[PDB]
Design a protein around this nucleic acid. Sequence first.
RNA 1: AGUGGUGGCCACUAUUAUUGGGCCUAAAGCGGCCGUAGCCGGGCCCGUAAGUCCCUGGCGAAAUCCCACGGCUCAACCGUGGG
RNA 2: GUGGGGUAACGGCCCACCAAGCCGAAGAUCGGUACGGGCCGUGAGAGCGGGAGCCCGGAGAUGGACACUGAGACACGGGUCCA
Lengths: 143, 124, 93, 173, 110, 242, 129
Amino acid sequence: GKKAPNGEFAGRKLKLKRKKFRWSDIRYKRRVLRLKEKSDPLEGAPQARGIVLEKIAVEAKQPNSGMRKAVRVQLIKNGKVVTAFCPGDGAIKFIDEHDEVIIEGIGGPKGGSMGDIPGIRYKVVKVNRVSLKELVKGRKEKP
Amino acid sequence: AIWQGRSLKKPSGGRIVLARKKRKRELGREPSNTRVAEQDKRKIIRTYGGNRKVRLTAAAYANVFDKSGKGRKVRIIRVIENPANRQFARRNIITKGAIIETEIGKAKVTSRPGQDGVVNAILL
Amino acid sequence: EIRIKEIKENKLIGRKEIYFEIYHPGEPTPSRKDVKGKLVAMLDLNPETTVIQYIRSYFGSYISKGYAKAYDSKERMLYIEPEYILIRDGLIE
Amino acid sequence: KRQRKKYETPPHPWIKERLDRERVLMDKYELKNKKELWKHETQLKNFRRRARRLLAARGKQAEIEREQLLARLKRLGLLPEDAVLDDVLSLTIEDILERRLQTIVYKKGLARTMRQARQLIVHGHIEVNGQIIRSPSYLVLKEEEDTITYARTSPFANPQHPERMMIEKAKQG
Amino acid sequence: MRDIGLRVQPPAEKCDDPKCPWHGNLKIHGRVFEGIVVSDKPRKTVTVERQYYFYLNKYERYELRRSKIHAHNPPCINAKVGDKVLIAETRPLSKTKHFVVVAVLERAEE
Amino acid sequence: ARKGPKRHLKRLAAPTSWYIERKAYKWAVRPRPGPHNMRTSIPLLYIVRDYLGYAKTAREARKILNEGKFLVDGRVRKDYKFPVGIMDVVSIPETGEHYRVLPNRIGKLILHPISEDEAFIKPLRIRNKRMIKGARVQLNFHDGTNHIVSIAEKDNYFTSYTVLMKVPEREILEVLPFEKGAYVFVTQGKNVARKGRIVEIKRFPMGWPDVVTIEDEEGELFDTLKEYAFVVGTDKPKISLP
Amino acid sequence: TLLDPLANALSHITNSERVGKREVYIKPASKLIGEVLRVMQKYGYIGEFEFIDDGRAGVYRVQLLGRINKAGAIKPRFPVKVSEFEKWEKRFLPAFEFGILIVSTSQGVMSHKEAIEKGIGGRLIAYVY
RNA sequence: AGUGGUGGCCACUAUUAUUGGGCCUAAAGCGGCCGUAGCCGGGCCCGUAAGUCCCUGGCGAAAUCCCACGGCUCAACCGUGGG
RNA sequence: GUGGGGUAACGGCCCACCAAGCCGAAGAUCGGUACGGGCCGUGAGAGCGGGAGCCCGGAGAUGGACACUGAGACACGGGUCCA
C-alpha cells in the first residue's frame, strides 16, 4: 500500500514511527547507548601507555602464511591486558619485557583487526618514549 | 530553619531534587503567638531590606471600635473563640479574627498582632 | 618634509592638537628632536609646552604619521599629561 | 568560534583531468603552491554562488545586493561596464589570474619572466599607487592598474640598474 | 457591578466571596484564554482545557496538543463540565490556581 | 552564584544605542542609576571622550569633569557615570556649545547642535500623576524628574502631555496636550526618529497601550505606541529635530 | 471508499492521456473539480469542458488535446506564503515555470502564477505539467 | 613549512526515506476477523472566521552569518551602512 | 475550600478545621544522561551531531548542617558545628 501516515494532522505518529525504527539502526543505537565507551579498554583514548608482559607469535589467516610477532601489554590506565602488534620488520628485537610502550588503534574495519591477522586490535607506537618507526629504521636509539 | 521555599513534590506528586542550597531571603520567622498578660511586651525585628516590624508578644490592651467609628482603648479579659485553632483560645493566644471577651463585651479582631504589633477589634 | 593635516584647539583643555605627515623618502624614521625642532618653526610654539605623542611609520610607506600637542601654560602638562611622555620628550628627568 | 580557511580543497586529489589542467595553469602562471590557485577558485565559486542566489530572488534587498555585486566585479575589472547578471556564470579562473598583481606587472613588462616579477614584488621593488605591497597573490583593482610602477627608493627606479636594460630589451625584443 | 477591563457581561448574582473578580477583592492582569471546563470536582475550582495545533518542521505536519489550566471558579458564575468559558490571569491563588473564570460563553446543554 | 547587584559592565552587552566600538576593550562603564534607562541613556564619559573627542583617555575626561565645565540641563555633573538620556541639553559655556541628545533612525543616540535660546527649554512627557499629602499634585515625567502643583491646577495637566520645562530654574512654560493633530516625535520602535501628526488614538481593551496613528509630512501613515509618542508641538514642532 | 474526488479525477486524466483517449468523464463532479478544470483550460492544456446533470453528482466531460505530461494532487494541502513558491515549485514542476500549480486562496481556486502576481498565499491543491 | 599514524561527528547513505527506501522469490504483511482511541473521510447551499492567507504595531541582547564601503601594506582582523 | 501563622510579598510556604481530590498511554512516577541558550561542525538542501574559546542566565567554593553583620550573604581570600 501507500506509505502512511500522510495526513496534515498526523505529526505524532510520524515522529513516533521514525523514533521507533531509528533504533533498528546499529550506528545510532551504539552511539546513544555509548556501548563502546563502556566496553573500550582504552576508555576512549586514541593513545595509551602500557607495560609489556610477554611476546607472542600469531598465525595469519589462511590462505596467507606467516608468523606475526606481537606483545601482550598490561594497561596502566585500568590494568586490563591487551595484545598489540609490532609493525615494521624485525621490530620485536627492539621491544623487551617490562618496557613502557605507547599503543594506538590498528585501523581495521570498524577499528577492528586489520588485514589477515585476526583478533589483534592495536599496534605499538612508542617504547620508553622513543618511537618504533625510527628504531626499525635505526635513526634513533632506544634508551 | 523555617524555609518558605518550593514544595518538594511536583503538582503531579513527583519528588523534586533541590538544585541549590537555601537562600537567606527565603526563610520565614517564628510564630509571634501574642499571649494575654497584664502588660505589653514586644520586639521590633529588623527585616529584609532594613525595614522593621513591631511584633507583639504579650498583650494587655486593645482598641475596640463601635460601628459608628469611635475607638476606645480597653482591657482584654480573655479570648472567647479562636476559629483558626481550638488550641489558641484554650491557651489564651490572640490572632486576627478571633473573638475576645473584654469589659465592653465581645469584640472581633481585625488586626494581626504578630505583624502590626497592636490589637484592633470591632465590638460585637 | 612636514605637512600638517589637522590642527584642533581644545578650548576646554587649552591645547592645540597637531596631526601631521612627515615626508622622509629614502631616509630613516626621523628622530623626535628633529621633528620637534622643525614643527616649532612655522607654528611658533614654545618647545617646553609642546609634546609629541607618537610617530608611527606605516609599512612600506615613506610618509610617517605623527601626533603632538601644544598647550598654553607650563602647569597644564604637569597636571594633565602622562608623566612618561615628557620623559620621552625629555622635559622631565 | 574559530576562523576558517578561505580556500576549499578539491573533492578528490588524483583525478587526471583536474591534475593536468591545474598543472598547465601552474606552469603558465607560476604560482608557488596549488593553495593560491584553490583560493582563487574559491573566490570564483563565491561570486558564482552570489549570482545564483540573486538571480532567483525578488525584493529590494536582492536588487541592492545585485547592484553591489556588479559594482564590485566591475571595480575588479573582471567584467565590462555593460555586463549583466548572466555572463558572470561564464567567468573563468583565468580571468582572475589575469588580474593578479604578478600577472599584471609581468604584462606591464617590468619582468622578463613572471617568476622574476614575483621576486620583484616580494622584495618590494613594485609599488601600487605609490604604496608597496609584498603579496604577489594580491588582486589588483582596475583603477589601480595604471598606477603600478617601480618602488621609488628601490634601485629599479634607476634606469641604469644592470637588470633593467635586460628587462627593457626583452620587452623590446 | 464593577468593570474588569474586559468586554463581557457580568453575572446577575452577587456573591459575598472575596475572591470573585466581580464581587471580590482581587484584580485582573495578564492573558485571557478560551477553554472548556473538563473537571469541576474541587470546590470553587475548575480544570479548564485548551486545545491547539502545534507545527512541526521536520515533517511539516500539525500535532494536537492539550493544555490543562487550573482556574478559580467563583460561586457567582458556577461553571460546570463542558462549558466553554473565558479564563483570565490573576495573582497566585494557590499552588496550582493562577487563574479565574470571567464568564461562561457557552453552557453544556447547548 | 551571584550574591548582589552587578557593578561592572562587559563591553559586549552594552545597550545597542551607543556608538561604541564593542570589541575594542573588554570593559565598559556601567552607568549609575539616574534620570533614564540604559536603553534611553548613555554615560556622560562616553559623550566627553568618544562623541566629542575632547579627551583621548578616560583620565583626561575625568579631570575635565572634575573641573565642572560640562552642564547637563544647566547643572554641573561631576559623576562620570552620570547617564544622559533623551531630550537632555548638554552645554559647554567655555565653548558655548549646546547639544540635545536624540535617537537615530537606526536607533542610536546623537548630539543635535542647537542655538542658545533653545538650551533653556526641555520638553518633558508626563508619565504619571499622583496625589501627595497636603492635597498636592505630583507629576512624574519620563526622565524621572517630578513637579509639584496645586489641586486647583490639576486639570491643566494630564497623562502623556508634554511640559516645556525651564531647567535653569525649573519653571513650567507651556503644556502640549496629547490630542489629535498635535505634532509628535517618536522615541522608540521601528518608527523611531520620525515626526508627524496624530490621526487616531486607538484604545484597546484587555491591557495594551493606545496605538497612535501618525501621518508623516509626505502623508505616509504609520502606527506607534502611546508610550513612544512625544508631543513636540501643536501644529509645528517647537524644537529643532533631525 | 472515495476519500477524495479531485485526486481521482487528476489520476484519471493522466492515465487517459498516456494511452491517448479522446474524451474523459469524471464521475463525482464537484465544484472544486470544475474550478480546477477551468484553470489549465485557461492555460490551454485542455479544450472545452462541460457539466452533465446526472442526478447523483453530475459528470464532468472533457476532451484531451494531448498536452498534459502528468497531473496530480498535492495531497496534504500545505499552506504556502508568497515567498515559499520556489520551494514547492522545485518539488513538483520539472523545470523553471514548466507547468502550473493550483492554489486555493482567499480569492478562489486559481493559478500560482497569478497568485504571485496578486501576491497572495494559499494552499496548494494540485500540480500539472 | 608542513606531512603522515590513531580515535570521535557529518557527508559518503534514498543503509532512516516529510521531500525520498522497501515488505511474491533477496530483511521485512501479524494467520484471520471485530472494534475503542487516534488518523483519513460523498455532493450542494446558508452561517462563524478558529486554523489558514494578506496587511500592520511591540518583540525576539550583543558577538558570530552574508553583503558593499572604509582603517591596519592586501588579507586575516576591526569600524560604518544594509539584510 | 474556610480560618489563621509567616514573609519585604501572593501562595498549603507553614499551621488548625472541612472535603477527596491531583496526574497518567497526548507516557505520569521511576531510571539514565547533561548546566541551558546565543551558537558551532557537517551537508546542495531537507537534516544530522556538540554545548567550546567568548557573551547572557544558572549554580559551587574539601563534602553535609547552621547563624551574625550588612541595602544586598547564609558570604571562595568572614563566622560556628559534624565528616
